[PDB]
Amino acid sequence: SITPGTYNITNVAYTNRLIDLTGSNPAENTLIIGHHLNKTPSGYGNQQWTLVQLPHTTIYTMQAVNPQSYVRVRDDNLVDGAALVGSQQPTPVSIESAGNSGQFRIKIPNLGLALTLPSDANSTPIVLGEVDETSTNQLWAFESVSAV
């Protein structure tokens, strides 16, 4: 399982893309997108995500460092194609190991849906897609944000 802590999160199909909250904006319904790294070595606070775990399970919340918005599915509408956005309230996610070491799926608990990135263009929105075991557009890797 991924240990609790603060991370950058990169896509496996598109290795030059991080999970990013548009414009560092705290408003409801601000889009979550794929984007190039925006500061060396670990980004500004809109590309750093704090993971909190329910012990002895694979269930987590995800919250940005600055501003302090959670990851949520828009309008709590748990269907194929729905948008990911920033909000004052989270959607709980299940972070599940895949076939290769160090690759994870970010899944909706108990439903056949997962976070996916459909293109390499900068600022493409992240959306839900059907589970597909080997599709690298819905697999992700974690890099720690290390402080002193």
Next chain:
Amino acid sequence: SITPGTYNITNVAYTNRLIDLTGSNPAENTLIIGHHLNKTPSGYGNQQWTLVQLPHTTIYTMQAVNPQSYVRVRDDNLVDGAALVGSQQPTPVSIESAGNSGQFRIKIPNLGLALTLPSDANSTPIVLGEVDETSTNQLWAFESVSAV
């Protein structure tokens, strides 16, 4: 949401029945049943349940005081009629208020299934059943345990 802590858990249709781990047995796959209170004022450790919450959500685990077994759906088989059992691996549950003051449903997240007690017969097993708006055999209330 219900405050974290240690509780007895009584059915709303059948107020003489507590959630109980059969025989205080530590084995994997031991049945969870409805049963009369087994000690004054708050039972032994097989009738006392500790609730741990994921912050800013309604998702919890449930663990008995002695032996220290979690609540699990048998073989992780999330369908109508499946058995509830004791195990070292928990199933995450969503605990949601029902309005009359102090009453709740104990649901499987994102599915229309909930813990149900089918009869008042002593030692009847607890199973999954479908959610509705009116039946009292899928509603539960809580008594705090005073450790001292």
